[PDB]
Design a protein around this ligand. Sequence first.
Ligand SMILES: NC(=O)Cn1c2c(c3cc(Cl)ccc31)CC[C@@H](C(=O)O)C2
Ligand SMILES: NC(=O)Cn1c2c(c3cc(Cl)ccc31)CC[C@@H](C(=O)O)C2
Ligand SMILES: [Ca+2]
Ligand SMILES: [Ca+2]
Ligand SMILES: [Ca+2]
Ligand SMILES: [Ca+2]
Ligand SMILES: [Cl-]
Ligand SMILES: [Cl-]
Lengths: 361, 366
Amino acid sequence: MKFTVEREHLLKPLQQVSGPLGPILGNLLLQVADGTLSLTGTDLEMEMVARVALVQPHEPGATTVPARKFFDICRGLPEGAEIAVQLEGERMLVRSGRSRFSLSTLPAADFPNLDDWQSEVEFTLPQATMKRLIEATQFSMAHQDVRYYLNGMLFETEGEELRTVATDGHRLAVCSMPIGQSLPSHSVIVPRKGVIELMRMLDGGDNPLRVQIGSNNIRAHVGDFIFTSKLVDGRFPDYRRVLPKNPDKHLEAGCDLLKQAFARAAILSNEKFRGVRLYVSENQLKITANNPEQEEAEEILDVTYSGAEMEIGFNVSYVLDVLNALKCENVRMMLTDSVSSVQIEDAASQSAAYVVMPMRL
Amino acid sequence: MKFTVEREHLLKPLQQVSGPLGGRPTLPILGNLLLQVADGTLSLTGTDLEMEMVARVALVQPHEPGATTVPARKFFDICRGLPEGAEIAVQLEGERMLVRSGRSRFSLSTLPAADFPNLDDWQSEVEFTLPQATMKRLIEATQFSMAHQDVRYYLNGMLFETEGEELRTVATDGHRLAVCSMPIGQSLPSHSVIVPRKGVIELMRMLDGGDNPLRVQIGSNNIRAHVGDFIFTSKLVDGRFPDYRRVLPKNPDKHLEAGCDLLKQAFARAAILSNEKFRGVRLYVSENQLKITANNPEQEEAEEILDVTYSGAEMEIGFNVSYVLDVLNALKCENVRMMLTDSVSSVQIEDAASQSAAYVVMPMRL
Ligand SMILES: NC(=O)Cn1c2c(c3cc(Cl)ccc31)CC[C@@H](C(=O)O)C2
Ligand SMILES: NC(=O)Cn1c2c(c3cc(Cl)ccc31)CC[C@@H](C(=O)O)C2
Ligand SMILES: [Ca+2]
Ligand SMILES: [Ca+2]
Ligand SMILES: [Ca+2]
Ligand SMILES: [Ca+2]
Ligand SMILES: [Cl-]
Ligand SMILES: [Cl-]
């Protein structure tokens, strides 16, 4: 196996395939075949593959090498460097200028594959749209809940919309985007680690994303990268049951002003229960916090609100996470009563909605 | 006690006086800042009983004298969290301190200013003034080589040595050494003291980059640094420091000069395949050429060759590549000078253009 490739063509692929990797699971599979260098990394649940066209002379074959070490060496070489690689006995030689490295290998035959599977649902969308969908909701996924089905993100197709849902059983995020195709009605749960890799492969370019979903797998193809993940089992909750039935009380406020006010008030909230009380009244919002030491914060903001007066308590971190994810000018808070969930949206778009539960203070 | 002060006029002082505060105070009031309004000035003080920082703020709006203490982290976070250019009005009400700005209001718990501790009184024996850039350079050149929590407590800090008209800093962790020496345009007694590492970092960070000169006063057991509105005081480390003179190699006659970034990048690549614990790399030096090799227990191998300026006898030497990279990162120079003797002697490293800072690293066999 021999190839010679510019650093610039090798670096982004290596970065992508090597990022998550950690004995042969800590190596990248390199294969020279059909005019192409393929690089693959896996943790047995998901797999990233990059293809790189070889325009210089090359020789076929495959091996595996320590991913981090190989990435670090390539990244450490100067801009414009050419990287020549070849196999020698049990080692992989890497030469660039007068820099030389000999790395250990494990056999390509020992490198594990995901089980074969069949595509049942397929669609295309812009990368920016997938990016928006994941970024809108990803912060609301559980991390290591014993309900495994929450440690990931629902991807749902309905009509012409691709929708993401994430919840940790305390708060929820949902985002729907039209993608201009007639889609079957379907949903799957992508594990949180898979969601992070998928997000990270979105380069910021114009190449559309192609998505393939099977009964137990999802695949995303963008440019010369192919990501594959296993899916999570279990019944994901229904966001329509979490969204309030009819949140007819509508408050609108500047997103950054609201964020700042909540973050200041939070300073004098209980460290155990970092909650704040909201008093909504005609065109005014009052936020208060207090703690065991009898310390007290109060913030008063102008808002647009016509509706009955009410008081409701929230976890401040959940509201700040939402406001930070919206990145908007104005927010709409849609209220029911003092003991029911609140829905929050960008005042200028219904494309994403967030649900937070009231908090006993 | 009443004052009304622009947010920004409070933030830099608050940053400074919060630095001494230890994570788990020995007394409740050690988690607080002392606030005093007197003769047109707000003073703020934070301490950990070993060192103290005081900041002064001129009060141009109406004020009322008095003193109290408030929780440092909460008061800072409130001031920082208020909007750009906010006016911050503070007044003492019972054992609460009220803070208001716009339509934001906060009530903080206080502790009596009478309980706020002071450092022991002392007399200044050695004093000098210098540009704050000179002090910044001295500390930044050497700080990375101080020990961290060594039982050899005299290493957990930095020596400050006065001689003639020069101020010198030295730091070592008992493995590698950094020294920097700068003239300061004032005749000084021959003296040296050890500043504890926490104090060194506080001192470094009180230097804002501006044109205010720094006045240093050294006592038998204490040091004080005054710049602008800020006054820092620390105990000294009561120990004996090693002599840096004895570790500098004698008459190193084989000087290698190379571009700093080129040399740094070659070592950084070679380091990838060095032993993770002991980090040894080998240099082979020859006419205008350097070869660096590394290998690890998995028998992986790196080799770098680069052009350098070198006319000495051919030799080999090994070093800890982590120590050499730390030096190159501290130097941030155009060209570096490695002053070599032989395979069983230390190396002295300097900016090729300046003898002000020098670093010594020990040889390794492989
Ligand atoms: N945590 C609860 O009691 C109910 N609850 C649940 C969820 C939820 C979400 C919100 Cl915003 C608000 C409340 C929510 C999602 C997970 C559900 C489950 O156990 O499968 C339960
Ligand atoms: N001489 C020694 O055993 C190690 N050593 C020591 C020092 C040292 C410095 C260098 Cl660069 C290199 C090596 C160094 C200074 C601190 C000394 C002590 O124990 O008080 C010991
Ligand atoms: Ca092997
Ligand atoms: Ca939606
Ligand atoms: Ca704006
Ligand atoms: Ca109800
Ligand atoms: Cl604000
Ligand atoms: Cl070892």
